[PDB]
Write a protein that binds this ligand. Structure first.
Ligand code: MG
Ligand code: MG
Ligand code: MG
Ligand code: MG
Ligand code: MG
Ligand code: MG
Ligand code: MG
Ligand code: MG
Ligand code: MG
Ligand code: MG
Ligand code: MG
Ligand code: MG
Ligand code: MG
Ligand code: MG
Ligand code: MG
Ligand code: MG
Ligand code: MG
Ligand code: MG
Ligand code: MG
Ligand code: MG
Ligand code: MG
Ligand code: MG
Ligand code: MG
Ligand code: MG
Ligand code: MG
Ligand code: MG
Ligand code: MG
Ligand code: MG
Ligand code: MG
Ligand code: MG
Ligand code: MG
Ligand code: MG
Ligand code: MG
Ligand code: MG
Ligand code: MG
Ligand code: MG
Ligand code: MG
Ligand code: MG
Ligand code: MG
Lengths: 117, 142, 48, 58, 103
RNA sequence: GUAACGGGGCUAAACCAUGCACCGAAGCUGCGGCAGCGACGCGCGUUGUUGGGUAGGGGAGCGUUCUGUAAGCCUG
C-alpha cells in the first residue's frame, strides 16, 4: 500500500496562501514566507484585542476633560463629585453626551458641584 | 453603536492673536501647543487636526528666569565633520527672535506627518503689527 | 448480525506510537529521546 | 465561638515557603478573598505571622 | 427623547424604534421584555438624572432574533521553544427593538 | 555630534512634612460561553474548585492508499 502525497499537500498550501492576500511581494506568493507572515498576524491580533479596550477608555477620558473645563471644573474633581451624588453613568456614555448634547452635559456638571458644596 | 469620530472636511477653526510681552517662554509655549492640537475641544480626535490658528506678536519681548538669558545654549550640527555650532539666548534674540518661540513649540508637538501640519497654523511676528485683518482674529489672554 | 455489524470489545485495540509527526502529537522532533547522548543515537546503548 | 473576617491584600509570588503554608492553613486563595474563622489563640498566632499581607476585621 | 439603561454588564442609550444587540437572554423570539432601571432620561431641555435610577421610568422592548457573531481566531506561538496552539470562537447575542419609553 | 534630566522646557514643573482627589495591568469584580476533578443525591441535577509551560509521562481524535460488506449504491 503506497500513498502519494500530491493531492493532500496541495490543499494544505492553498489554504495558507489565501489568508495572505494583500501582503507585499513574496509574502503573498511564496509559501515559506507567507506561512511566517500568517503566524505573526495572528500573534498581533491576540495582543490587540486587549489594547483595543485600553485605547478607547483613554479617548473617552480626554473628551470628558475638555468638556468639563468649558464648564469650570477639571476631570478629577468632576468624577469625584458624581460618586458623592450616586451617579452610575460610565465613561463611554458620558463622552457621548458631551459631543451630542451640550445642555444635558451641563446639567451633570451642576449636579457634581452641588455634591462638593 | 460606535464612538464619534471627527471628519477632516467639516472641522471648524478660529483665529486668535496673543501678545508675548513679559511672558515666561515655556509656560506660554505649553498653552499654545494645547490649542494647535485641539485638546481643548470635546470633538478631539487623535488622528484628525482640530486646532485653531494663532498669531503671536512681540516675539522679542518674551521672558526667562534665573541666569538663563546668558546661560542657555542652542546646539546644532551642519552635517560636515566637526560642524557643531552653538548660540546663546542673547545671540538669537539679536539675530532672529522668531526662532526662539517656534523652537520651543516644535518640541512640544507630536513627531510625524500630522505634527508637521499642526505647525503650519502658528504665525509668529517680532513686532506689534500683522496683516491678517481679513481673517478677523480674536483676542486671547494666555 | 452481518459482516458490517461486528465490533471489538472496548479497550482491546489501543493504537501504537508514531514518532516524529509534528508538534501536536507530543512526540515530534527528538521522538522521546532527549538531547545529544549515547542513548539518543541509532543503535546506541550499553550492555547488560 | 467569636468569629473574625480575614482578607488577603497582597500577592504570594516570591514569598518564603513557610509563609505560603500559613495561608493554606487559613484558607485564603487569592487577593480580596475573605474567610470566616473562629477566634482562638492558635488562629491569632498565624494571623500574626503574615500580617504584612493580611487585613483583619473583627 | 432618549434614555440610558444597563443590561449585560454594559450600558446603552437608545431612542424609540431602534434595534440594539445585547448579550444572550433566555427569552423567546416574540416576547416582550421591560428594563426597570433607567439611569437618565433626556427630553429636550427636560433632563432627569437618576441617583442611581430615575424614579418611575421603564423601557419596553421586543425580542427579534438570536444568533452567533463572527468567528475570531486565537493563535499562540513561542519562538525556538517547540510550542504552538490554535482555537476558535463565536459569541452569542440577542437583538431587541425599542417600542416605548415612559417615565 | 549637544550626548552624565529620554526631549521640550522648568525658579518650581526641585527637595522636605501633612492631607484629600484622580490615572494606571491579561491582578480583582460584572455579563456570556467551554473543559477537568471531587462531593451530595437520582447518563441527570445540585455543589465546591481548578484550566502559563521546555525535557518527558498519560488520554481522546482528523485525514490519505489498499481488503470485506459490494453481481450493492452513485455516475455521459
Ligand atoms: Mg495504488
Ligand atoms: Mg504525489
Ligand atoms: Mg489537506
Ligand atoms: Mg501546489
Ligand atoms: Mg503542510
Ligand atoms: Mg515574489
Ligand atoms: Mg499576488
Ligand atoms: Mg496569486
Ligand atoms: Mg514550500
Ligand atoms: Mg486605559
Ligand atoms: Mg566640515
Ligand atoms: Mg572649533
Ligand atoms: Mg527640529
Ligand atoms: Mg524643538
Ligand atoms: Mg512616541
Ligand atoms: Mg511639528
Ligand atoms: Mg512649516
Ligand atoms: Mg512535550
Ligand atoms: Mg537534534
Ligand atoms: Mg518514546
Ligand atoms: Mg541533555
Ligand atoms: Mg554530546
Ligand atoms: Mg541523552
Ligand atoms: Mg544517531
Ligand atoms: Mg519579591
Ligand atoms: Mg565635542
Ligand atoms: Mg522620564
Ligand atoms: Mg532636541
Ligand atoms: Mg514650590
Ligand atoms: Mg508648587
Ligand atoms: Mg512643592
Ligand atoms: Mg518637587
Ligand atoms: Mg505626599
Ligand atoms: Mg483592564
Ligand atoms: Mg484572571
Ligand atoms: Mg456571571
Ligand atoms: Mg461565568
Ligand atoms: Mg496546558
Ligand atoms: Mg464492485
Amino acid at each position: 500500500a503506497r500513498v502519494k502525497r500530491g493531492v493532500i499537500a496541495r490543499a494544505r498550501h492553498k489554504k495558507i496562501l489565501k489568508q495572505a492576500k494583500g501582503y507585499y511581494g513574496a509574502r503573498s506568493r511564496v509559501y515559506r514566507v507567507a506561512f511566517q507572515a500568517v503566524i505573526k498576524a495572528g500573534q498581533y491580533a491576540y495582543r490587540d484585542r486587549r489594547q483595543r479596550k485600553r485605547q478607547f477608555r483613554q479617548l473617552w477620558i480626554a473628551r470628558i476633560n475638555a468638556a468639563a473645563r468649558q464648564n469650570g471644573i477639571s476631570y478629577s474633581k468632576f468624577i469625584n463629585g458624581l460618586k458623592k451624588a450616586s451617579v452610575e453613568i460610565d465613561r463611554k456614555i458620558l463622552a457621548d453626551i458631551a459631543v451630542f448634547d451640550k445642555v444635558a452635559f451641563t446639567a451633570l456638571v451642576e449636579k457634581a458641584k452641588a455634591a462638593l458644596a | 453603536m460606535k464612538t464619534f469620530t471627527a471628519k477632516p472636511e467639516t472641522v471648524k477653526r478660529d483665529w486668535y492673536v496673543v501678545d508675548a510681552t513679559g511672558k515666561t517662554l515655556g509656560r506660554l509655549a505649553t498653552e499654545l501647543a494645547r490649542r494647535l492640537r485641539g485638546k481643548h475641544k470635546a470633538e478631539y480626535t487623535p488622528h484628525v487636526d482640530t486646532g485653531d490658528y494663532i498669531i503671536v506678536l512681540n516675539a522679542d519681548k518674551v521672558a526667562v528666569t534665573g541666569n538663563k538669558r546668558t546661560d542657555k545654549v542652542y546646539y546644532h550640527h551642519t552635517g560636515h565633520i566637526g560642524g557643531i555650532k552653538q548660540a546663546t539666548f542673547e545671540e538669537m534674540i539679536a539675530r532672529r527672535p522668531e526662532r526662539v518661540i517656534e523652537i520651543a513649540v516644535k518640541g512640544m508637538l507630536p513627531k510625524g506627518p500630522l505634527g508637521r501640519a499642526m505647525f503650519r497654523k502658528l504665525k509668529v511676528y517680532a513686532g506689534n503689527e500683522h496683516n491678517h485683518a481679513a481673517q478677523q482674529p480674536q483676542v486671547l489672554d494666555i | 448480525m452481518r459482516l458490517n455489524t461486528l465490533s471489538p470489545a472496548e479497550g482491546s485495540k489501543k493504537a501504537g506510537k508514531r514518532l516524529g509527526r509534528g508538534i501536536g502529537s507530543g512526540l515530534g522532533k527528538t521522538g522521546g529521546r532527549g538531547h545529544k547522548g549515547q542513548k539518543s543515537r541509532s543503535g546506541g546503548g550499553v550492555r547488560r | 465561638a467569636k468569629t473574625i473576617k480575614i482578607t488577603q491584600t497582597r500577592s504570594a509570588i516570591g514569598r518564603l515557603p513557610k509563609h505560603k503554608a500559613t495561608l493554606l492553613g487559613l484558607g485564603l486563595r487569592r487577593i480580596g478573598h475573605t474567610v470566616e474563622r473562629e477566634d482562638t489563640p492558635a488562629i491569632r498566632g498565624m494571623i500574626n505571622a503574615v500580617s504584612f499581607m493580611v487585613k483583619v476585621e473583627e | 427623547m432618549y434614555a440610558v439603561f444597563q443590561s449585560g454588564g454594559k450600558q446603552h442609550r437608545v431612542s424609540e424604534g431602534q434595534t440594539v444587540r445585547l448579550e444572550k437572554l433566555d427569552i423567546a423570539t416574540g416576547e416582550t421584555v421591560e428594563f426597570a432601571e433607567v439611569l437618565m432620561i433626556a427630553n429636550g431641555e427636560e433632563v432627569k438624572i437618576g441617583v442611581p435610577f430615575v424614579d418611575g421610568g421603564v423601557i419596553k422592548a421586543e425580542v427579534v432574533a438570536h444568533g452567533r457573531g463572527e468567528k475570531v481566531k486565537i493563535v499562540k506561538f513561542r519562538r525556538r521553544k517547540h510550542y504552538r496552539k490554535q482555537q476558535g470562537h463565536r459569541q452569542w447575542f440577542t437583538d431587541v427593538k425599542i417600542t416605548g419609553i415612559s417615565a
